Amino acid sequence: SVEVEILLNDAESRKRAEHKTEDGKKEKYFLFYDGETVSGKVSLSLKNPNKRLEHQGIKIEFIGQIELYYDRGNHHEFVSLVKDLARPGEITQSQAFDFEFTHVEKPYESYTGQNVKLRYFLRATISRRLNDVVKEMDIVVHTLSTYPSSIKMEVGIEDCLHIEFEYNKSKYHLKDVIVGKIYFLSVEIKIKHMEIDIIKRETTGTGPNVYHENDTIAKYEIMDGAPSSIPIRLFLAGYELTPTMRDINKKFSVRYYLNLVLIDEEERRYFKQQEVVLWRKGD
Numbered sequence: 241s242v243e244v245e246i247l248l249n250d251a252e253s254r255k256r257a258e259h260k261t262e263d264g265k266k267e268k269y270f271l272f273y274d275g276e277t278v279s280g281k282v283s284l285s286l287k288n289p290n291k292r293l294e295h296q297g298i299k300i301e302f303i304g305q306i307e308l309y310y311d312r313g314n315h316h317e318f319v320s321l322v323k324d325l326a327r328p329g330e331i332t333q334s335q336a337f338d339f340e341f342t343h344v345e346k347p348y349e350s351y352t353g354q355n356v357k358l359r360y361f362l363r364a365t366i367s368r369r370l371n372d373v374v375k376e377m378d379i380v381v382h383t384l385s386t387y388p389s390s391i392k393m394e395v396g397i398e399d400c401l402h403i404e405f406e407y408n409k410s411k412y413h414l415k416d417v418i419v420g421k422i423y424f425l426s427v428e429i430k431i432k433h434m435e436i437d438i439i440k441r442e443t444t445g446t447g448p449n450v451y452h453e454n455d456t457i458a459k460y461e462i463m464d465g466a467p468s469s470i471p472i473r474l475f476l477a478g479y480e481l482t483p484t485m486r487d488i489n490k491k492f493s494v495r496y497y498l499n500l501v502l503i504d505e506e507e508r509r510y511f512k513q514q515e516v517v518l519w520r521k522g523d
Contacts, residue, residue, distance in 0.1 A: 242293055242331070244375035245283040246300075246362050259380045260352055260480070269380040272346060272360070278302055278379070279340035282325060282364040286334045296367035298326035300339045304346060304381075306491045307357045308446040318489050319345045319360075328367070346381040348488050349520070354453040355444040356492045383483060385519035387411055395500050395512045402426035405436065405500050407472070413521035414481045418474035418498070424467040430505035434462040436472060437499035438479070439513070444492040457481065457496075476518075484517045 248254065248270060257271040272278065282300050286293065304319035321344065325337040351358040360381050366373040394404045407420030422436075438458040444451045457479050462470060485494040496518050502510040 241287055241291075242366065242373050243285040243287060244364050244366065244373060245285070246280065246364055246375060246377040247283055247336075248278070248280040251280070257380045257382065259350060262352060262357065269378055271380050271382060272344075273382065273384065274346045276344060276346075277340060277342045278344050278362065279338075279342075281336040281338050282375075283336040284331055284334055284366075286331065289333075292330050292332055293366075294330040294368070295326075296328040296369065297324060298337065298364070298366050299324045300337070301363040301365070302341050302344055302360075303363060304348075304360045305358070306489060307359070308444060308491060309355045309357070310444070310446045310449070310451060316489070316491060318347070348381070349383045349483055349485065350380045351482060351485060351488075351492075351494060353442045353444070353492070353494065354455070355442060355446075355451045358488065358492075382520055384522040385413075385483070386522070387413075387519065391514065393498070393500055393512050393514045395502055395510045396426065397429075400426065400428035401502075401504070401510070403434075403500070403502060405472075405498075407498070409516070411517040411519060412476060413519050414483065415477045415521065417476065418472070418516075420472040422462060422470045422472060424469070427467045430465065431467050431502060432465075432505050432507070433503040435501045436460045436462070436474070437501060438474060438516075439497045439499045440481075441495050441497065442492065443495070445490070456499075481518055483520045 255271045256268040258266045258268050260266045300323050302321040305315045305317040321341050323339050361376050361378045364375045391410050392406045396402045402425045404423040404425055437456050440455040440457050442453040496516050497513040499513045
C-alpha cells in the first residue's frame with residue numbers, strides 16, 4: 241500500500257560509520273554527535289497511484305533508547321522527540337514531509353553488546369485503525385573525548401615468584417599502542433605459561449539481577465621456559481573496540497582490563513587485572 245522512506249538533509253554530505261549489528265554484520269550508518277540537528281523528510285510513495293490511503297496522523301520520532309535482552313520487550317528511552325507531521329486525514333498522492341529536530345541530546349555512544357544494546361533511530365509512523373505503517377532508520381552516535389606516566393601491576397607469591405608489568409598510560413584511545421615491559425624479578429618456581437590479555441567486561445543490571453559477560457579481545461603470549469625483561473606492544477587499532485562506557489543511565493557498563501596471567505609448573509594460576517579507560521579520539 242505505502243512505502244515510507246526517511247531521508248536526511250545533506251545525506252551525501254554527512255559521514256557514515258561502520259557499526260556491527262545484533263547478527264554480526266557490519267553496516268554503515270549516518271554518524272551523528274551530541275547536540276547535532278537531525279532533519280530531513282519522511283517520503284511517502286503510493287504503491288497504487290489510484291488509491292486513497294486513510295490514516296490517523298503521520299509523525300516522525302527521534303529516539304535514543306537502551307534495550308536489555310533479559311527484558312527484551314521493555315525499552316528504556318533516554319531521549320524521545322516527537323514531531324507530528326499530519327493530522328488524521330488521507331493521502332491521495334505521493335508526497336513528503338519536512339522535519340527538523342534542532343538540539344538533539346545524544347549523551348551516550350551506540351553500543352551493540354551481548355546482553356544489552358543502545359541505539360538511536362528515527363521512526364516514522366502512519367497511524368491507521370488496522371495496523372500502523374512503521375519505518376525505522378538507525379543512526380549511529382559516537383562520543384569524542386580528549387586527554388593529556390607509568391603504571392605497574394604485579395603478580396606472584398612472596399618469595400619464589402615476583403612478576404611486574406609496567407605500561408605507559410592508564411587511558412588509551414581506540415587506535416593507540418600499549419607500550420610496556422614484563423620484569424621477571426623473582427622466579428624460584430618454573431613458569432609453565434604466561435600471557436597478557438585485553439578483556440572486555442560487559443555488566444548489565446536488569447532489575448534485582450545483574451549479568452556479566454567477559455570477552456577476551458586480545459591475547460599476547462610470552463614464550464619458552466627461560467624467564468631480564470621483555471618489551472610489550474599491543475596495537476589497539478587491530479581489534480574491534482568501543483570506548484569505555486561507565487554506568488550508562490545505570491543500565492549497563494562496558495569496561496576494559498589488562499589481564500596478567502601466569503601458570504606455574506605445579507599448574508597454579510596467578511591472575512591480576514587493571515582497568516584501562518578507552519576513549520575515542522576525533523579524526
